[PDB]
Paper text:
Here we report the use of single particle cryo-EM to identify multiple proteins from three enriched heterogeneous fractions prepared from human liver mitochondrial lysate. Using this approach, we were able to simultaneously identify and solve cryo-EM structures of nine different human mitochondrial enzymes: short chain acyl-CoA dehydrogenase (SCAD), medium chain acyl-CoA dehydrogenase (MCAD), isovaleryl-CoA dehydrogenase (IVD), delta (3, 5)-delta dienoyl-CoA isomerase (ECH1), aspartate aminotransferase (GOT2), glutamate dehydrogenase (GLUD1), mitochondrial superoxide dismutase 2 (SOD2), catalase (CAT), and mitochondrial aldehyde dehydrogenase (ALDH2). Functionally, the three acyl-CoA dehydrogenases—SCAD, MCAD and IVD—are involved in beta oxidation and amino acid catabolism. Finally, SOD2, CAT, and ALDH2 are all involved in clearing toxic byproducts of oxidative respiration.
MCAD has a relatively broad substrate specificity but has highest activity with octanoyl-CoA. An FAD cofactor-bound MCAD structure was resolved at 2.69 Å using 18,616 single particle cryo-EM projections. Consistent with previous crystal structures of human and pig MCAD, our structure is a tetramer consisting of a dimer of dimers. The overall fold is similar to that of SCAD. Each monomer is made up of three domains; an N-terminal α-helical bundle, a β-sheet core, and a C-terminal α-helical domain. Residues T121, T124, A125, L128, F277, T280, R281, V284, Y398, Y400, and the catalytic residue E401 form the binding cavity. The substrate accommodation in the binding cavity is determined by a network of hydrogen bonds among residues Q120, T121, Q242, Y398, and Y400. In the MCAD structure, helix 4 and helix 6 are shifted relative to the corresponding SCAD structure. Several of the mutations identified in newborn screening of MCAD deficiency, including the most common K329E mutation, are not within the active site but instead appear to be involved in the dimer–dimer interface, which would disrupt assembly and limit activity.
Author numbering:
A (entry chain A), B (entry chain D), C (entry chain C), D (entry chain B): 36 to 420
Write the structure that this text describes.
């Protein structure tokens, strides 16, 4: 029957993640955000505690955890800080295509190294000319004997300057009229290959401690063995990685919203205006109640999506619902929390403004809200045929 | 661990409820709403199928089902029609205080009769002067020997003119300064007792097939044996019945929203404007996607509340969250569905306008949205102490 | 410079309209809505006071008032009742094409009769197959000598069963690929012409005292003199009547919202819950403040649109903005007012539920909200070319 | 009658302000925001063009413009940059109490200096312990012979480190039970007086080019001639300055929203996704239409408030409505504009993220949204007595 109770192992994972977050990430998150420095010690500590690369199977040396455990761990880490959590989950996002569409040789070679030492990997799909239209990318992969020549440029690549290897999606079919199901090929490109020109670090409004760079490929030689299932099969692999990665980003948004709610409540429990405690004004109490409702609903949505994908079904409908709702409620919670603190909320010495700046990408990256609504509408309509 | 899978018995209950609803209630719901007639045959059929009085324990002849099964059955029935579902759930709402705070004699006497024949019961708490302020009622219960003399009037009583017996909450303590925890007493009052004057049927905007009447009590003699746990214990019983009844009304709102979404989608799949199908306009598709998201979130919320109360914990926080969110999304879905059908939506020969009229009470009765937000804020604040 | 002060004549018109509304329409509006009877005495009284057919020029015997005065009068009448105001403004809506695109003979013949006696006219454009897509109508007008043969059916015609003559828009060009600018012709069709089959009165959710019927045309002979500017010029006339009619319906929505706000405030000033006046709870006060803000903004928007059209400019942008915003805020205000009254709000003996039922058409008829947003987006984009 | 047409002088002022903004402020606004430097050259240029200190009467050497002209100028400047506009309007905010409650000597002495050279003034009311509760300030002013000794600290003072003199509000009455109407006194305190300790520059989320500092007063001697109307009259002066200053900040929010809308539209007119221009997707077009509607409504609201105060009436109701609505729509427009640009919107090399960061204070300073709703509710309720 229905159940909303964690297992003992999941409880242990949640306790470890919460302890690590609230005892390591929080004391230094503000400094890392202010300086924009890459949190190498925090990433190493997360790797040591087994909070990173959770999806790697036990055969390759990983823990082989499901998406539910990854979601709860990512929620705790995002409660810690969203930039650090994004940097950590970039590894899982890059690894997912290799895990789901890789043979034994590729899996061992490109995941045992991740298990042995705290390395990083990226997910190079987005281009300057097409970010939402995945079929609109123009990076070309030309086959030359036993190698592929890749030319093009990618933009907004998380861990672009820190990754050990990249998952690259390029258009193998030169025919513009070729269908998207047979035109794109996935590759495993090492970061040290000649011809890769990593661009400057991009400065963003939020999550300033994470590394986001543009990458330019110029006559990069990729061996034939570093190809996925085959030519023209890249698009399906890229689209199938989303079904397992979207609940994680939804969980991160939920954790950010939970942090904002905690800060707002803790501030409202001590501030006094008009001779009464700030929580004794009905407007503030109703605001807090609505924030709590949104947080609980978003958490339930992402947990449902994670359980759905973990059970072997397709969770595109639930994953899109959870991602969209979490992205919206994260921004709403962040702005409400900034409103609650008043003038101190607008100041940079209080955590709420950082959360407000960080919450914006959850409506942009990993599929914008409009794309999520498109997917939800398509699935809903298909349910009526 | 977490699970979102029904049991086989729950699947059978859901199948029976859906079949009964969509094959009996729907063909006659419009006529019953238009004429305002009490749906006696539908209530009898629901009683025959075991879809009514589900909370009665097996000792008294009932099925002894949990609130989860009641919630799913009520969702299916509300998909059928909200007026019929409200009339059916009035029995459970009236019976809940007797089930949770009744001795063997009272339980047998006042529940075996419900099991044997399709009788009805009501829940008389609300007064013309105080509906939300439960502590503000002024019906007085004066003890005279081995009987209680009750004087006062109640307003907005579901099944007021059809109930076999009433659950009455009256203020036993005449001291105005007495605390609410020791001032109110619950009673089991039969409908045939002299001194009970049932008023005229009230005409409402929606759910016009349900019976809602005001009741006037004038020197009604109630035997001492028809009293609950004791004098001054009525308030806690009344407040504890809510923890088990609110998920049911939330499920009813969810079912109404699901009906509205189904009607809107089915209409949008055939209507053509500007040379394209009505679902091919991005505005309509986004509207449908948001409606589906709201429906799924509300369903998950009420299911979580039902599971929480079924596990022995206190679910006031989750029940209030589910009730508030379902009440809001029901009205939003109803008005969006009326918008989708255009001019035909405003007409009375299409089901959407009836749903829009019916959806309003879910933000009013069984605790208004403001009271739900008050409860949610109180629980959230208590979680931080 | 800028000014927000009425003229003395406009103040006199507003005073007369408010007095007539609040002393005649309100005492009988509930009865007319409940019985669905056509308010003939109220229409006659409005005609006697000069509150109807305001756009007729002084040459034809009318008052020759601008759209600003019509807007304020319609706002007062809609504060009285929306059904009566809709029945009254149907005359102006039907007459506007004749006023703006009629020669002296047609204007005299078909407006002097309106001036002399309280007659009615309708606006037959919408068809069962296309209501929003005006270019999608399929009523055909075939020229036969000095007459036009018209075949087709219209749906949702205000004053359909009471009009003395109709303004009919039909597709003269049989070529499906013909542009909309040269395919439709406008006609002045008398209601007594043989071949016109008025259908049954349609029953709607709100404004039940207004007459809305479907009309079937079967070989109706229209003389050549009853044609507007010429063949293929009907579409531009129909689209230009909107620029002068939309502010009036926006004003009606504003008046309905003002009525809802007045009822909610007057109820909240006497109701007491939890020992305090209902207006002393911050939630209720904030709700009332937001309602007042919305009412004021909508009033300013429609007044701006009326002034813009009265100054000789094109006000499509402002008219669409005002119509959309007023339509939204009317429904929001109505549902908030129903929420404020609590259980009494859901009852039919209080005016708020009638306002909630009536407010829905302002998001449907005279251009749905989606069409208004389309027009606003088109104008906004054109401003950037 | 009603009019929405500017005068020729107002058109000239608007043209000058728009030219200055879009040719001087925009090219350097990003650099000033990034470095946090005080825009001295821009302030000097605005002073030279007569765009600063507009409220000073012609007797003291000012232009003697009404609040309408100040509102339009501030809207243009805020379209330029919100930080520069805030720095400029700080002078008007500080000067307003002196203008409305100053004798000839004080007006000449403390406004002729502003006219002669580009000096700055501040408005010191807010304290660390009470920002919204103006009656809750605790800065004490003790009279000692012909001087006042002032002790206390102020927080969030615009132009705190750059002002030539301050308007200080202090509690003269030491009795805690004294009414607010007779307990506070206003002072004109020069910035060079010994005992004034200007704190460090505060770092905020947005408007980082404006100077906001905390000020500590320690035994500051203020001569008796630098007092306003008298002891206990400070509170009314402070509350009356709001009626003339709130429309200006509302206009600034409107200008920021207009800038966001312009950027979003200009980007959407060139970006192509899924083979179509980004403005050809109905979701984006509807978003733009709603943004334009909000901008127009907010502009009309603030213009109405400015005209109302310029006509000699009290505009507290309209000023609060305009301030609240403009503050809300500014944030909504900013976040929608960031959403439209997608990934580029989150980057710091595009203007939208700066607007999103800047828009937050319009819901915080000069009266938070909750205080505005309180004022609107109070005025609305008083209208019904
Ligand atoms: C901090 C950050 C980190 C990132 N990390 C990664 C990473 O690791 N890997 C990676 O591959 N990418 C990454 N990205 C890129 C991200 O995935 C894309 O930028 C995002 O999916 C949208 O890209 P875009 O701005 O080009 O969208 P655009 O298409 O340029 O946006 C246009 C706007 O219109 C909307 N829109 C577009 N098409 C439609 C339509 N058909 N209907 C309706 N609305 C529509 C969009 O929602 C958007 O608001 C990152 C981006 C950021 C900001
Ligand atoms: C169709 C129908 C069936 C019903 N059936 C039953 C039944 O079977 N049994 C039964 O006992 N009752 C029944 N009721 C009554 C219902 O439970 C109450 O009417 C409802 O709880 C609110 O009653 P009220 O209108 O008196 O609320 P009021 O208190 O009169 O409403 C005042 C308004 O202010 C708000 N408000 C009140 N107090 C506060 C506060 N402190 N803070 C903020 N906002 C506040 C409320 O939300 C409401 O909008 C029924 C009502 C209806 C319409
Ligand atoms: C009470 C009443 C009185 C009326 N009186 C009159 C009258 O006097 N004269 C008259 O001519 N008509 C009248 N009408 C009809 C009215 O003008 C039309 O019904 C209305 O414009 C919409 O008609 P529809 O339902 O066919 O719209 P539909 O097009 O059938 O509605 C489809 C739905 O999709 C939306 N939609 C449609 N096209 C698009 C698009 N391209 N993009 C996005 N969304 C879209 C619509 O907003 C709507 O929600 C009346 C209607 C009513 C209810
Ligand atoms: C950039 C900036 C510049 C500023 N410049 C100036 C300046 O030049 N001069 C000046 O005097 N001040 C200035 N201020 C201060 C500003 O005026 C105040 O900070 C603001 O009015 C609110 O202050 P607060 O944070 O103390 O509000 P708080 O009262 O501490 O905020 C508490 C929260 O609860 C809400 N709240 C409070 N009371 C109630 C109630 N009764 N009911 C409901 N909700 C309530 C508030 O809206 C807020 O969200 C500036 C502030 C900033 C950020």
């Amino acid at each position: 029957g229905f159940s909303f109770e964690f297992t003992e192992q999941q409880k242990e994972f949640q306790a470890t993640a919460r302890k690590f977050a609230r005892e390591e990430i929080i004391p230094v998150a503000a400094e890392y955000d202010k300086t924009g420095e890459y949190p190498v010690p925090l990433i190493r500590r997360a790797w040591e505690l087994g909070l990173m690369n959770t999806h790697i199977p036990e055969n390759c040396g990983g823990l082989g955890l499901g998406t539910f455990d990854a979601c709860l761990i990512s929620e705790e880490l995002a409660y810690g800080c969203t930039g650090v959590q994004t940097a950590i989950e970039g590894n899982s996002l890059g690894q997912m295509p290799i895990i789901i569409a890789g043979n034994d040789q590729q899996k061992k070679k490109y995941l045992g190294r991740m298990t042995e030492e705290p390395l990083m990997c990226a997910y190079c799909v987005t281009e300057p000319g097409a970010g939402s239209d995945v079929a609109g990318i123009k990076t070309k992969a030309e086959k030359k004997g036993d190698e592929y020549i890749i030319n093009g440029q990618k933009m907004w690549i998380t861990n672009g300057g820190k990754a050990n290897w990249y998952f690259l999606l390029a258009r193998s079919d030169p025919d513009p009229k070729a269908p998207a199901n047979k035109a794109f090929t996935g590759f495993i490109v090492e970061a040290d290959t000649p011809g890769i020109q990593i661009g400057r670090k991009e400065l963003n409004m939020g999550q300033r401690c994470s590394d986001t760079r543009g990458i330019v490929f110029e006559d990069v030689k990729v061996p034939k063995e570093n190809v996925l299932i085959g030519d023209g099969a890249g698009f399906k692999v890229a689209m199938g990685a989303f079904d397992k990665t979207r609940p994680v980003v939804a969980a991160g948004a939920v954790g950010l919203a939970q942090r904002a709610l905690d800060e707002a409540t803790k501030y409202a429990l001590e501030r006094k205006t008009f001779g009464k405690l700030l929580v004794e004004h009905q407007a503030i109490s109703f605001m807090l109640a609505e924030m709590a409702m949104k947080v609980e609903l978003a958490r339930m949505s992402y947990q449902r999506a994670a359980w759905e994908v973990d059970s072997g079904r397709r969770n595109t409908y639930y994953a899109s619902i959870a991602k969209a709702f979490a992205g919206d409620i994260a921004n709403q919670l962040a702005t409400d929390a900034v409103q609650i603190l008043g003038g101190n909320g607008f100041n940079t010495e209080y955590p709420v403004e950082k959360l407000m700046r960080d919450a914006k990408i959850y409506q942009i990256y990993e599929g914008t809200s409009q794309i999520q609504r498109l997917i939800v509408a398509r699935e809903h309509i298909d349910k009526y045929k």
